[PDB]
Structure 1
Amino acid sequence: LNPESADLRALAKHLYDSYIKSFPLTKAKARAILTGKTTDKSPFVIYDMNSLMMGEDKIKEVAIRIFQGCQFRSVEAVQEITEYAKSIPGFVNLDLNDQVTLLKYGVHEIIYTMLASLMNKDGVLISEGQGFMTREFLKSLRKPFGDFMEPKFEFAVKFNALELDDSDLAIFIAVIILSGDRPGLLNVKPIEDIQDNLLQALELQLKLNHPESSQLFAKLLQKMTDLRQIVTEHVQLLQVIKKTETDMSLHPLLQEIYKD
């Protein structure tokens, strides 16, 4: 290690530190619950209509209720991600407008990155890990709701194969937020300078933590293309909902985000 790389390590430690402080459910905790490393942290499995009402006692119409649940957790994440953002060096010093723009386009890409930590080919964790809803149950929901989660799962399965851990992800989502190609950015240069530093930190982090993983750095940046697609698709389905479901409300915070 040299004087320059040492600064990168310092930045990684910081971000990873702020990550833990901002997200109550890390991937480490999620993988531990999902892989039987438990007896005290075993989740209740929801795989059908009956287990749904059963769990609602342990952890209108089902479909809508489930969707209303996703909303609640989304707003939660936005709040958490927004708190993590503030710890990214230089972030809060940027033009307020840009701060708003970066969160606007970055929040959902981050959510799907982290939501993968709570997934496996067969399902996803819910209620801070207390529950576990099967991929099949969600895919059987009343249309067009049964189409909501499938795309996320497909991504998660591929993304999870990279075997990244919390310390890697902490820098990675920081890179996501600080994107100079966001639409409407007033001052791009300042942002790119921060991202340039994060990328440097990520690269070193991946090299050190994943020595036998060839071109993990490059393979990880390409995943950013997968996230964009998932976001584009979500908005489309969300539009359909807005019209076929005029009696269902959407949290204003989330509304201000999709107006892109």
Structure 2
Amino acid sequence: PESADLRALAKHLYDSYIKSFPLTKAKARAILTTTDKSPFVIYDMNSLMMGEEVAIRIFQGCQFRSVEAVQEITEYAKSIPGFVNLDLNDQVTLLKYGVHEIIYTMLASLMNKDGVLISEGQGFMTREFLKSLRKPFGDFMEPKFEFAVKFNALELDDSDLAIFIAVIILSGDRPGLLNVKPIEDIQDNLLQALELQLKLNHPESSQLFAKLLQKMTDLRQIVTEHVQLLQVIKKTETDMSLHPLLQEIYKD
């Protein structure tokens, strides 16, 4: 039926997602669970030193990946049908507020309860090593880990994720949007696509669609705690700097 259109939309978004994100969840899980693709593990200072201030070295590295990620997400967004046709100011707005939610959603795919893949999967940084950086740097990663642990339990694959993150981008409740309605119509179509996708890809997973949507609460709260941490760093490390792209994303 029009189901066909919805499948086509799912298929389109999956395709674009692979084109946009060079480290998929499927690649990630395969690394986490071979010989040619095993990661070097950083769990302390010497492992770090052999892998290549320390907490600032790590934070800066985290910044660069963050900037790279926003770049990927921007490319993916433009593939979402209708997105580029929206008012430019709104495109920018949608990007600014969607970027964190997508970054942490996808970061889950790179995480297990013990650590997180880095440097395209070549490296693996342990939760405890990150939990042991000087305050409050030692505390930026725990809520992401906790979220990922619950989120990974949903057992979503890349094809699921492609649609879900498209749904996130097209959030008409973002502050300062000029034309809510066209955004909401793209999102309605994306939601229907997502719903169908979940029903077909996880036909035993009861009300998975609802549980996925419910996980927006946790995402929201994570973003909030993160900006608070950024505000402390601002005043303590005045020698330090946020990347301009990241600056603009946190302005309001």
Return 5+ residue gaps in structure 2 as ranges.
Answer: none
Query: How far apart in 2 are the matches of 1:257 and 1:237?
Result: 15
Query: How far apart in 2 are the matches of 1:258 and 1:40?
Result: 39
Quote the residue 2:199 is aligned against: 207
- 2:215 alignment partner, SS class: helix
User: What is the TM-score normalised by the length of structure 2?
Assistant: 0.99
1:178: Cα distance to partner?
Answer: 0.1
- 2:147 alignment partner, SS class: helix
Which aligned segments of 4 or more residues in structure 1 are displaced greater than 2 angstroms? Answer: none
Query: How far apart in 2 are the matches of 1:16 and 1:44?
Result: 29
Matched residues, percent identical? 100
Tell me the alpha carbon deviations over residues 53-88 of structure 1, each in whole angstroms, 9 at most, x when there is no partner: 0111xxxx1000000000000000000000000000
Tell me the alpha carbon deviations over residues 174-197 of structure 1, each in whole angstroms, 9 at most, x when there is no partner: 000000100001000000000000
Query: How far apart in 1 are the matches of 2:48 and 2:134?
Result: 15
- 2:173 alignment partner, SS class: coil
1:249: Cα distance to partner?
Answer: 1.2
Quote the residue 1:99 is aligned against: 91
Query: How far apart in 2 are the matches of 1:91 and 1:104?
Result: 14
Query: How far apart in 2 are the matches of 1:179 and 1:226?
Result: 16
Return 5+ residue gaps in structure 1 as ranges.
Answer: none
1:21: Cα distance to partner?
Answer: 0.1
Alignment RMSD (CA, Å) = 0.4
- 2:2 alignment partner, SS class: helix
Query: How far apart in 1 are the matches of 2:158 and 2:245?
Result: 27
1:116: Cα distance to partner?
Answer: 0.4
Quote the residue 2:22 is aligned against: 24
Quote the residue 1:236 is aligned against: 228
Query: How far apart in 2 are the matches of 1:143 and 1:241?
Result: 10
Query: How far apart in 1 are the matches of 2:128 and 2:243?
Result: 27
Query: How far apart in 2 are the matches of 1:219 and 1:26?
Result: 22
1:132: Cα distance to partner?
Answer: 0.3
Tell me the alpha carbon deviations over residues 157-204 of structure 1, each in whole angstroms, 9 at most, x when there is no partner: 000000000000000000000001000010000000000000000000
Quote the residue 1:178 is aligned against: 170
Query: How far apart in 2 are the matches of 1:137 and 1:174?
Result: 33
Tell me the alpha carbon deviations over residues 106-164 of structure 1, each in whole angstroms, 9 at most, x when there is no partner: 00100000000000000000000000000000000011100010110000000000000
- 2:134 alignment partner, SS class: coil
1:92: Cα distance to partner?
Answer: 0.2
Query: How far apart in 1 are the matches of 2:63 and 2:248?
Result: 14
Query: How far apart in 2 are the matches of 1:215 and 1:250?
Result: 40
Query: How far apart in 2 are the matches of 1:258 and 1:151?
Result: 19
1:259: Cα distance to partner?
Answer: 1.1
Query: How far apart in 2 are the matches of 1:42 and 1:169?
Result: 24
Tell me the alpha carbon deviations over residues 221-247 of structure 1, each in whole angstroms, 9 at most, x when there is no partner: 000111110000100000000110000
1:250: Cα distance to partner?
Answer: 1.0
1:215: Cα distance to partner?
Answer: 0.2
- 1:179 alignment partner, SS class: coil
Tell me the alpha carbon deviations over residues 241-260 of structure 1, each in whole angstroms, 9 at most, x when there is no partner: 01100001111000001112
Query: How far apart in 2 are the matches of 1:204 and 1:140?
Result: 43
User: What is the TM-score normalised by the length of structure 1?
Assistant: 0.96
Query: How far apart in 2 are the matches of 1:69 and 1:225?
Result: 28
